[model samples]
Target: TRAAVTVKPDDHRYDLLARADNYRFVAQPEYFRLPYSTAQVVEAVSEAVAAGKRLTVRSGGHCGEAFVASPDVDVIVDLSSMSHVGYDEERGAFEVEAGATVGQIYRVLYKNYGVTFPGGFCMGVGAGGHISGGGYGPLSRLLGLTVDYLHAVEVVVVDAEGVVSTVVATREEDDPNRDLWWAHTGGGGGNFGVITRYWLRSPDAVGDAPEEALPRPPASFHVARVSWSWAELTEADYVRLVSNFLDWQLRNCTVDSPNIGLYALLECFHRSAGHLAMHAQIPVDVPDAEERMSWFLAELNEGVAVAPSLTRRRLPWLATSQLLAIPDVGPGAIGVRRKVKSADLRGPHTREQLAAAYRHLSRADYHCPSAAMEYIAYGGRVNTVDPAATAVPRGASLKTFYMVAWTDPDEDEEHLRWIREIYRDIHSATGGVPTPDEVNTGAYINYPDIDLADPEWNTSGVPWHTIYYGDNYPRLQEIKSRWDPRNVFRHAFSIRPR
Candidate 1:
């Protein structure tokens, strides 16, 4: 491993500091420190604490909020160079460094051992923040959230005395530091301290033999794509389409549902784009996987006058991963100033919510076609685990993504406001953000939005913590107090110690 090095403002590489994907905001860190090892990370945190510098850590910079880009961040510990993924003999599991990207982990694990860990779809995402916040994806509905298989974690934490040290915790209940491990499972990264590495092995996993320690990787994948022209959709058409999709999920997203292998994304494009599309994926070996695709499309389009033709195919498992890699690109890649808002919905959007989506998506005056909503199927094996088992939100059949991508900085506010208005209107019954209800169980922490923490945007009478963590909030607070009493690691959405 390389030694930790500090990059000063005067250095030639200083210009590279503003690598935040969201050009709308950037940080001015007085110094950028790269730590290649746990010891180096300790040294960096110690130096920052001694200097009283506000510090933050960045792995992939995929954070949706300005958490790492905030003006308050004086020092940024960049772990991108620490990327490492391998099996640990003593730990009896796979070890992934905080800097390792999802692509690296997937390739290394699958190619070397024919095993897979359910994680994010974007290959650019770092395992550090992703797994810590309950990594979700198509495989998640078949297996469970990534955290469910988490065996242990290695983190560098700050104490009340302004001192820095490292701690390793595991899912083993007998471990004294289990609480520390639980906090990392869904607490969100910045709130705790800097996570150095993670250890993974399925709960039922037995032998140290690599293949037996994790779920066997699926041999291949079955996929289906459905598309519809916006010209074919009236406001009534839009509402009915959304209703059909949601209704199917509400009824079929059970642990034992035959469609458990099916993972679908409903992309509702803006009127200017003039189209809507649905993408579905499943392990090819899953029983009746092909039939499931046919059934899904047939049922969702039963009441609809016109629907997209269903196109289904099978590909090698790795090929599907590469194909679905958004940031890595074949399709689904976006290079623009973007704002993202998310909600964990238990049931389908209400009639009012559907109307709001149609109004916003079809507004002729607003021309940003890239701004749209994606409601991804969210339940299956994910719901099998208890809510308290991890920090992930529960009982959600749909994970709603409200997003806007724009090229010109000039239209920033317009795009932001437009999406905000639609999102707020959809949840108008719960202020500006989703609140726990029969249909909605709030939001996902991984898709963090500072708006949920701001009173101006959130009037749901619900605190942002409640929306993200629910009853898990208090436990996280206690852990925060114990592990980061000095509040050394914090941001807009960071948990506050009680």
Candidate 2:
């Protein structure tokens, strides 16, 4: 029992998480989780809840908003230890630990039988939070989300008696706690109990039992990175390129196929003369991947009169993903101070919205002085799953926009204001999705923007709870009520038991 608790100051074993990316530095054991078996984590978590304590849980530190990384934070429960992968071929599935990053699982699956689960874009993102908040990314267009294929999980929950129980659920059986499964599908992360390991694919699509689990693998294909330079683009050309890519991506995600995968990265930097830009990599699988890429290139350079900023490269590999939102625009929108924000696009934006984007970019106050937005595309197999099938409710193909701003440290606030204002402005006008609740869904827990919980920033009208959990909130709430009713696994935005 004492393993979970560390006294204050010198006696503390867990770091008081302060910054979102704070875990990147200081490998202190204080910021640790005393997880042994999935069963042990359950025991410890439940005991704490019985004592009525505030709690926090984490895997990877990608919240970017200091949600998981805070020095003032106490009672942290790290889940990184739970992320190990196991394959159950007889059941046509695999065993994935909750703390595993999408990339970690992807690489492991790839090395195995060439099978994989769909998830977020970055390698460092936590699987537990990503799945709970609806994982997305390049491979999603080819494979349904991680939740779409989620079979089961082995979880430990704490009861009122301070007793922790290890429970397992399969998709087929009448789970006494079916709601817990549903909540993890799209609900925000760290809400209910500390999830240890998700018994993924415990049951195959056609049969029951773990041994029969082996998911069908998509056939291998070539990889391509079609890069575009910023100096090579005209203001008009940039818009056209982005718009055209969106159009094509939207069509395919809604179309449904296994032909290819689409992912894009738009990276730009400010040069002494202007901006140096490049479209990092676009993954496509087709008979003429090159041709399709060339077509997009032409569209990118369509009218703006920019030439090639850099050459395009191609690679065929596996990856996962998540998305971001583009904010609103205004006159004070200066990009000098520096900031970054992400938003997801499930539907198309209006023309006025598009025009405003150009205006915001044209502002002298704001400059891509050192960075730009990255838009990852979607299509193909991603559309095969029903939106209701996964916690990630984005049934439609989306356009995600990410802004990177930089300036002198003194102008930080100004730059930060410019980025945030632009994000809020552009999104409101274009019907972009910000907080998970504002639209059909909420923010990715891995992306962890606490503003979504705030009444001011999210603008979703719905509280942060709905943004992450959706209809599944009530069920997860029940789990919280039964297991950690005292709200032991608490974060500023975690699901609270009523």
Candidate 3:
């Protein structure tokens, strides 16, 4: 930013910036001048990188994790100003400014053509980070991941000479930068460049894909809850119920009813015990969802409660979510900088595999009262797409496990040590992080564990790229080298230029 720097005492944007909860707040409010054009954004970011400032390239600050907001770091290049979207009915594509919120984009598409971009559910997340990370929304089963429908993108990239180039991604085979087009599809959005605008290919861009092909959202959904008392349900019962849900996912995800997306959100709460929460949604057109869910609807939690035993102890607890990868590359390894436990999701778990997961999920630590098992149900259409069609590689899996925890800074060593042991113990049977069989195709990039870059945390034998973008990582690097070789735009999991 060539403009003078000023930290004015009072202003609404600055007020909001100061109270910012995502991580830390640094505002150049009066000094922050955002260019409506891509060229201006390029100049601003390029200047920051050249000056050797530790920057957080943020579009939407929706990632509640430690990555977005931190006590560390200085310059924050906020992209909140970059939001605008317009549709071209003839081209069946829309031009979206990267900073625009999801709600804004959705409304634009709906108001214009009753169309959508198959992105994630949150309205506040930014298009830049979400799209690049292979955004998946409620309509995923019907359409595909948001990346799948992405047609093209226009970005501001800075080169070694401090020269800036505005690039675009389109479906034209003859397009000069065909590789850039591929990169935007699922290259994990922010890694390649400072994106100014995204060119979204409509749901039916190439020829008429058919109205039936466009699935409709359900008008009404019954949100149901099933509770399992950790105090009463024997370990055996807990494992069985989890196994049943896995079996249901393994058996039922088919193309016949792609729109039927159901997830068994396994939980151990801030308040309650292990409860299997079911979010079963069927399209309004679908005649039966209750019947479908009833197939596995056994009164598994009949008359069970966590109180008078689990809660009777009257204690506090912490929790976390683990996305289980297939086979097993178990547990988190120790690091001086940070300690963590995680694994990649490979595919569906067998009954035996489910038993192993159950064992891990059911393990409760009195000190870590939030110990619980959570299952994010997959299948139906998520698995129907070819693995290479999108950057998200978990399509093969029928479910994902989110294991979580809460602990004190003083107990960092001990608590992390316990989590590592638990991670290893759970995946002990399956080789972790190094091999494809271990489900270590890589950890989610959004999870941002630099340890995956280190050989220690990732033993499944797979490289980090395979985990984040699956086969899409290489293309991302090329784009990175071309668009941001100096690596002006980067983060923990950003693609490194060759």
Candidate 4:
């Protein structure tokens, strides 16, 4: 077995501690254990446990929260060296190491077998957290969540007695570890165990052929960008624009809708950004894709008085995917500090919510150009699955992401206040949280926010677990008890053992 490489604070490589995506937090672990394989991971965990050190695992370091970069952690097992993606002929599926980034997986899968999984938009997100958190992206409207295609997972877990071993769990009904597999489906990472690898194959796939084992990507994509200058946009126009976008989603986000191939993100930036934009894409294979896009654009511009500048282009499948994966290059892109909150929408926002959004986005007191409310199209095939089938229960009509990014540490409180006030005002009817209701379906665990767990911010009386997992929390807890009885794998929002 290969030994893990240890890097201490005095080591030249110690700068790895600051590699977390959010610059707001940096871990001061006593040492970083770099593991190159599952065997090494087990060794690292065993050693850390025997030493009585509080340890955590880091895959891509892209987590929005400080789960990996917390003061309580002593050793961080870095998995960056384990990245490997290839088809496993014996298993009749694609095997992806937990350390692989979403972009790397996509590029390798497409290049090798012309197949791809519906993962997140960010290329830098690691598979370890992204897959377990219910991966979703532009193609999700036509396909489904990435976990829907998961077949098995290999995890390195520590037992109650501090014994470390690797456990391979598959979704096969007769498999003794089937429950363990189910728990990983949207259960969120850093809970049950540290995942080492994932085996993916679509449920209905019938052949052993690599291309047939997963969904083939679209042939091409018709991309469009529509932006309205905030200088000329009045509150009335803003409300109408957002309302039209929501109305369209409500009508077209059905499982059988012909518009399933269409996906859009409405970016409502702060007035300081100078403009609000909508980015949309539709597979060229869709019937009259160009015409449908034109019609959709016209519908969004119907009631708004200001004319929006429009840009359209057609790109090959891989090109479009790569284009969308490009990281932000703005001023906030370097050493960015961010606060993000998420909510699933069961229906269109009420007029009051729309007014609240406009008021906050146009507020002169908060001038952060990076502050914005993003509305991403949801539902479609994602809603067809039974909620109980996975840990992610809510298959809502749309997903709303609220975020504010900055570089100045002094402005942290100001930016946080802006995002929190806007989110609270939007969900005012639900006690300042997105409690499950007629219009809201709680939050997405992928974009985890500790604020939801704070009773001070989450005055809705709903526990954070219920908001993220719905009724699946009990089952997850049972699995955690069975697989991690010692509770070795845990975080601020980890599943509590029953």
Predicted structure 3: clash tally = 40
Ranking 1 against 3 by lDDT, winner: 1
Q: Model 2 Cα displacement at 359 (Å)?
A: 4.4
What's the true lDDT of residue 425 in model 2? 65
lDDT of each: 0.85, 0.54, 0.53, 0.88
Residue 219's C-alpha lDDT in candidate 1? 88
In terms of TM-score, the best-performing candidate is 4
- For residues 321-438, could you state the per-residue lDDT of candidate 2 as single tens digits? 2122111123212222324455655655555555556555556655445444555565455556555645554544564444554435665666555556556666673233354433
> What's model 3's lDDT at 408?
43
Q: On residues 161-219, what C-alpha lDDT tens digit does candidate 1 reach at each position?
A: 88889999989979999998998888888988899999999888877799888898688
Model 1 TM-score is 0.97
How many clashing pairs per prediction, in order?
1, 75, 40, 0
| CA deviation > 4 Å runs, candidate 4 | 326-332
For model 3, residues 77-179, the per-residue Cα lDDT tens digits are 5677668777645455677788887767765666455556566545566887788776764456556667666677777767787676777767577888777
From the highest TM-score down, the ranking of the candidates is: 4, 1, 2, 3
User: Per-residue lDDT of 184-266 in model 4, one digit per residue for the tens?
Assistant: 89999998778999999999888899999999989899999889999888889999999999999899998778887889999
- Model 1: CA > 4 A from native: 328-335
Candidate 4 yields a Cα-based lDDT of 0.88
